[PDB]
Amino acid sequence: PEEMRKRTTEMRLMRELMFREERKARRLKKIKSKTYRKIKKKELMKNRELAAVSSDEDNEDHDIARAKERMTLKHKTNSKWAKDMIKHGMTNDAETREEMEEMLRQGERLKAKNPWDLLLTADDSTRLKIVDFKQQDVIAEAFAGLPGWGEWA
């Protein structure tokens, strides 16, 4: 049947689609500049925050996260990277100091302890079905004052 042709086209579009994400994904992969990646990360955190994609943490979830942080103490300046930057005067620079402070604030977050949404469907179905013109338009009247796709058109 000719329905088989329809199947091939649908696959062809899906294949052409997958390539496009691959090409774009390949190119974004190569760019690894800090400023570029920093801008993308910031914009992503806004979108997730604004859309509240992330679920609220229960009190038990926070306690477990706090427990691991106390168990490990992974976000203090005793880590290998933090100790390396501090002891060698590389944190006097502003940028590497920001990363150290970013790490430290993130650690601090985990350490913290008469009587007097349902989106409205304004479609035509939710309607006050009230019941009450051409001649009145005659009263107004008395007042006065694909073609060409394959063939020549």
Next chain:
Amino acid sequence: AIQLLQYLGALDNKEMITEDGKKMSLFPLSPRFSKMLLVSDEKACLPYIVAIVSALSVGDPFINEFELRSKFYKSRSQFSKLDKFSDVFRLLSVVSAMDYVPKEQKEIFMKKNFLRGKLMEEIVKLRKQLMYIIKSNTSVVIRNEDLKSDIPSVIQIKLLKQMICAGFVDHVAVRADVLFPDDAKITNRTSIINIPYIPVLATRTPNIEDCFVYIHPTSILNNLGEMPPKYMLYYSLHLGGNNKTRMNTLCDIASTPLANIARKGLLLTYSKPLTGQGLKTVNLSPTERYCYVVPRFGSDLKIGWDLNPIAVHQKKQKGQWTVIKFITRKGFQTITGEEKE
């Protein structure tokens, strides 16, 4: 006037009357208030919308502080109980509260609550005429029993905000610090009455402060005690004595409902699909997809602003992607899972 009617859906883009436009003309009210009554059919909210519409149509039955203390605030405390962010529900509280007042004590109630006697009586009269026209034209004798209504549910109160926003889609104002934090620096010491807002579709000036609009002294928000809502509905703008524009608030509206209502109006546009962790354009087929978009609200000579991203279902129609329906966070997550399985 044509533009306002078009935003309400009264007129189409070619300035002919729509079916809604004909439908509103049957009522004795302004086009804004009709639209409130038009959408009220859901979940028996009609009695509340009629009361709100009658109150606004007739004028405020409240006596202001300037025109006149503990007694005044005491009466105000009683009628603001329905919602802490709505002037409209303060009006609804009084009008429906009167219904349970027996006729003999009505005069004592109006004086006891600093309420203008004449206006409420016309509000009563105009409520009957509205309920009469709707019952007569929907299928008629209306008694005072018919106006007696119980408290709205929490679900209803959110809906009333949406119906109210339907008629005042063009009078939404956003806190200025959200758009221009540099120019509108809000501190915890700042009085609520001095927090700047920016109306939608406001004509941009070289100095943005010229467009600022502040809360009216009479609004309950001045006594709110916390930061005001992100977006606000206002009825009209008044020039205060200090050359400061003051806005008569109606009620607060959240971002996602606001996009929902403006979707049917000309006041919403959709950005390109978002990309990143969580936000991924799920492709069912070459013609339909699920994705997150950033709705832009407002009409580039005016003040429009972007709303929170909302998951949408898009379909490719004649080469262009058209948003069919909105999707909850759970609905999108399950969708992302389904294609993985």
Next chain:
Amino acid sequence: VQDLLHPTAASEARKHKLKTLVQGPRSYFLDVKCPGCLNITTVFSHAQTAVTCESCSTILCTPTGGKAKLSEGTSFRRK
């Protein structure tokens, strides 16, 4: 979930020859009957040589990338 000690027959059939539980050849031997003399000759499935029938000196198979292609008209059985 699967049991490594007792793999499914189809599962092993899908795997590479060296990657099964006990590696073994996937090739085999054939009895090819010459069209003329009707004698039987043993031919390797993946024969790399143009096997010739000794009596008639007729080509029975031709080498290729993998399995040898048997000459047209030659009957064969798996031995």
Next chain:
Amino acid sequence: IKFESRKIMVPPHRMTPLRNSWTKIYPPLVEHLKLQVRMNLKTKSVELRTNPKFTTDPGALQKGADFIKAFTLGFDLDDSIALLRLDDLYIETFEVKDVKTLTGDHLSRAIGRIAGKDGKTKFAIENATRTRIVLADSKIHILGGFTHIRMARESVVSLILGSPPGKVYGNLRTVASRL
């Protein structure tokens, strides 16, 4: 108004948009310009002809062909319609390799710099210079007034040669104020 014809071959990647926009393409051609429009599916070329009995403006045919050509290069329909509306719009076309022989990632970054993040840089040039720019891979087309396309070209070329977008953006504000 003699009988004349124009043929404009449609490249394959522009055929599908031509389909979805055909409803809005033949009305202005057949109504305002009084042209006989047709697409030869066998050759996949848009055919326009002058009707001697009906067509009156001698420049309608060439005006229509440029309008089809502008859509063919990748310009949106409404921008292409500007060619029918006006008579003083021209299309400037040049390649990246003409400015500078860029290859590999250097060519990819040059295209990215011209477009800018979310296309902001391209829109910045378009608004300031009152022109429309189509960035087809390494092929750049600019549409607008003659004096305007040259201004946009210089801003584009500075980006190709390596000038950062930020500095080019400030230059756009200056010329925009002068305009």
Next chain:
Amino acid sequence: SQVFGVARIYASFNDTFVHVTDLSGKETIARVTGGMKVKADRDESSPYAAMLAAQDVAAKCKEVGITAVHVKIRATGGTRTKTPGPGGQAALRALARSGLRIGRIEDVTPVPSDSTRKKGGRRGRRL
């Protein structure tokens, strides 16, 4: 009753030529350039210059007897840009408006299979 010539349009960066010749190309009928129709050398590449040049040749060709021309538009080509400029586009439009019948339009820009080096240098050109 219908005589054909060939209208060669050479659209460079700093000028536009409109040259009308017989079918062979040996015999020149009328050559007019943007410079001959403008006072300032800046505007020689301007579309307005081309329109005047196109109109002048169109008038001259009608006097000779030529009533239709095949357009062979070209750019500088070679190691430089390959697409005709607005000066060439303007010249084509003016020729159509002139009433002179346009037979066939083709681009004959010299395109190299692969060419010598470009004058810019490693850092580019056209600041």
Next chain:
RNA sequence: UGAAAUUCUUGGAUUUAUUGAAGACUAACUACUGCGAAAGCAUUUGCCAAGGACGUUUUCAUUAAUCAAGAACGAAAGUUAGGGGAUCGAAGAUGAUCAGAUACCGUCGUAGUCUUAACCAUAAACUAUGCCGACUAGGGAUCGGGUGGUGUUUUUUUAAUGAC
């Protein structure tokens, strides 16, 4: 050129057509895809040798991994001695030196760019990421080979191949 001027030009410039000569380079196809130890490699055809992967119920049987010493190759530029010398072009000269988005522009152009026989041995020679071996998730795209189908198409006699 932002406008000019050095420049060519009634002994015919620029442009047009028919040819001819020289030296380079292989557009579009072109894709982080393919090949090579790396540097690198893109017109057709032939010759010479080399190579990974795959298939093998072929053969040897520890012959292997990493590697101071030592050796082969090593972009571009550059040096020695011939050849060539179209384009572009360090150096050098020269016009103009007015105007800040177009602010370094123009013209002539030596060495070079190309090649043969030797030197030099440096790169952001980059995945800013040693080599060998083992193990630890799913998905579908692509390149080379192999297996399986009673799948489509072609072979327009079949077929068998080839392509999907």
Next chain:
RNA sequence: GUCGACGUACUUCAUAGGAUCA
């Protein structure tokens, strides 16, 4: 010779971040 390169010994500049309050 207030000379160049190297070796050696020193000096110096880049530290604040979050919360509350006025």
Next chain:
RNA sequence: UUUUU
């Protein structure tokens, strides 16, 4: 300030 189906 007025005022309206």
